[PDB]
């Protein structure tokens, strides 16, 4: 059965990115929408919107490609997963691509990046890495 | 394996083979020569290797190799043996230390003297 919706979202993104699709659709949830918000604000995806589906609602994500058709996402990794979950304090927050990437952290203040969490002095669960 | 499989069974390291079990944790042992004889090595090489049968103080009967050119070992001769393998001989893991106890340093040696128990010329 489906165990990790977040990892399934990340793999849909990765598979669409490898296939040079301009479009990727998936069932909607609040957490996935928040991750889409962070990805868009950090400039990794072009734009996202949420339609409605036959049963519930869908999430639609536009993949950003450069003029010469080079992908704007180099990698997508799921860090904390069901089973082994990863939490980090405000001081040992992870670095992605030596700081060139972004780590998404679920704090009690919401979804933040590694830099935002470090600046606000908070910790939480390390959801994923984007670079 | 899965993380759950790890927490259930864990990782077991490989066991280490004990070397020179006759020494019993000592760098050297003293023994008495049960029999002093000679033997022939494995096929690719050929010589008359000099080997002594030593009964150590750890109550283990062990076959030891005699380095150097000439030796003065006979029956009932107290020797000090160390660890060291000789590739040619199949089951020899010990060498007799020259210049300790009954065994004498080699004669007319001028290089690597400390490894054969030969004093400096006066």
């Amino acid at each position: 059965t489906m165990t990790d919706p977040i990892a399934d979202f990340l793999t849909r993104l990765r598979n669409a990115n490898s296939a040079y699709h301009d479009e990727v659709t998936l069932p909607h949830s609040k957490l996935k929408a928040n991750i889409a918000e962070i990805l868009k604000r950090e400039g990794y995806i072009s734009d996202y919107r949420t339609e409605d589906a036959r049963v519930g609602k869908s999430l639609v994500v536009q993949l950003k490609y450069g003029p010469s058709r080079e992908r704007s996402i180099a990698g997508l990794r799921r860090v904390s997963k069901p089973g082994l979950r990863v939490y980090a304090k405000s001081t040992n927050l992870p670095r992605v691509l030596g700081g060139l990437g972004v780590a998404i952290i679920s704090t009690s203040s919401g979804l933040l990046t590694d830099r935002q969490a470090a600046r606000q002095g908070v910790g939480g669960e390390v959801l994923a890495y984007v670079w | 394996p899965t993380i759950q499989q790890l927490v259930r069974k864990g990782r077991r390291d490989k066991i280490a083979k004990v070397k020179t079990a006759a020494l019993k944790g000592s760098p050297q042992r003293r023994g008495v020569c049960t029999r002093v004889y000679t033997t022939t090595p494995k096929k690719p090489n050929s010589a008359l290797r000099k080997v002594a049968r030593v009964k150590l103080t750890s109550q283990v009967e062990v076959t030891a190799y005699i380095p150097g050119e000439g030796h003065n070992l006979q029956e009932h001769s107290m020797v000090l043996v160390r660890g060291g393998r000789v590739k040619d001989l199949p089951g020899v893991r010990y060498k007799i230390i020259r210049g300790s106890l009954d065994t004498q340093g080699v004669k007319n040696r001028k290089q690597a003297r400390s490894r054969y128990g030969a004093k400096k010329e006066k």
Partner: protein, 48 residues
């Protein structure tokens, strides 16, 4: 690093024996009331 759930049995002391099997009860530590008996029943949060 995984979170592991472990279970442990303690022996509590209730005077009137109002607690059946399956009830969420609350305990508080106390001085040894016998061998192996170190807990005192405070109250039953919810019966079952």
């Amino acid at each position: 690093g995984k979170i592991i759930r472990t279970t442990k049995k303690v022996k509590a002391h209730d005077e009137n024996g109002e607690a059946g099997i399956g009830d969420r009860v609350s305990l508080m530590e106390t001085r040894p009331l016998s061998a192996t008996k170190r807990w005192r029943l405070v109250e039953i949060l919810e019966k079952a």
